[PDB]
Design a protein around this ligand. Structure first.
Ligand SMILES: O=c1cc(-c2ccc(O)c(O)c2)oc2cc(O)cc(O)c12
Length: 274
């Protein structure tokens, strides 16, 4: 699919930088015709077929196709797409409360954690209902609408690894952040919606304790820990945490994807179900 090739600067004014990554930068922007504000993610294109720099057309088009499908309070909304020779530019809904990652850097109670988790679960329920696996769930990829309220609302972002799972699994060598990836990703096995539920388990552990369950001193150690399900609930962190909360995590951090809680299971779990 081709995108709008008019100069984005003719329709938007950019401002504050909102984020930055390997082949992308995100800038706050304002549409001239409406005065409405957005986030513009500029994604560098591949300059040749066999280069490893920039993002392939295939990966870019997959991400745009998924973003065009989704409309839910807990997932980011895509407004427009532009492109030129160097970049594809996603004009995205503006979310101004920063990353959950940065909010966490400033441990929650179980209520505060479930407040966040319920919204993450609802957003993932929407995605999995459409057979969309996100494949990169982590606190950095959850944004807050406003971080100065008692119960911040959240939106899932960063669908750069997301895939439609129309055959129950995909076999693609998809691979996200070592701390959060499921064993099947570490082992290069076929992947499905189940991998997101493992990631939710890691996120939950972090929300409750401020600690990462599998994190080693090197990437290879972290990956080895993940594959071996090498984690435990340290008493220093979890002594005041309910056994039901631990049960929720335990049923997600399960190596066999078929035995892992599904998104529907997670919403019906006694720790979550009201
Ligand atoms: O960093 C941000 C990143 C993204 C984002 C959203 C969806 C994607 O598929 C993606 O690849 C990136 O959306 C935002 C939306 C915002 O309002 C503010 C932001 O910082 C971001």
């Amino acid at each position: 699919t081709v995108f709008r090739q008019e100069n984005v600067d003719d329709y938007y004014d950019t401002g504050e930088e909102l984020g930055s990554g390997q082949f992308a930068v995100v800038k706050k922007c304002r549409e001239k015709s409406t005065g409405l504000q957005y986030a513009a993610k500029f994604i560098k294109k591949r300059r040749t077929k066999s280069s490893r720099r920039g993002v392939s057309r295939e990966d870019i088009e997959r991400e745009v196709s998924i973003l065009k499908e989704i409309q839910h309070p807990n997932v980011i909304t895509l407004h427009e797409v532009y492109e030129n020779k160097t970049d594809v530019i996603l004009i995205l809904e503006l979310v101004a409360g920063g990353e959950l990652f940065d909010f966490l850097a400033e441990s929650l109670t179980e209520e505060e954690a479930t407040e966040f988790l319920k919204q993450i679960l609802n957003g993932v329920y929407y995605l999995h209902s459409l057979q969309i696996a996100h494949f990169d769930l982590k606190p950095e990829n959850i944004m807050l609408l406003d971080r100065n309220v008692p119960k911040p609302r959240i939106k899932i972002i960063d669908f750069g690894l997301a895939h439609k799972i129309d055959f129950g699994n995909e076999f693609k060598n998809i691979f996200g952040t070592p701390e959060f990836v499921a064993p099947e990703i570490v082992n290069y096995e076929p992947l499905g919606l189940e991998a997101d539920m493992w990631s939710i388990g890691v996120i939950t552990y972090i929300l409750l304790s401020g600690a990462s369950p599998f994190l080693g001193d090197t990437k290879q150690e972290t990956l080895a820990n993940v594959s071996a399900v090498n984690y435990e609930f340290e008493d220093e962190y979890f002594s005041n945490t309910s056994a039901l909360a631990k049960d929720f995590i335990r049923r997600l951090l399960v190596k066999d994807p078929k035995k892992r809680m599904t998104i529907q299971d997670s919403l019906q779990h006694p720790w979550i179900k009201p």
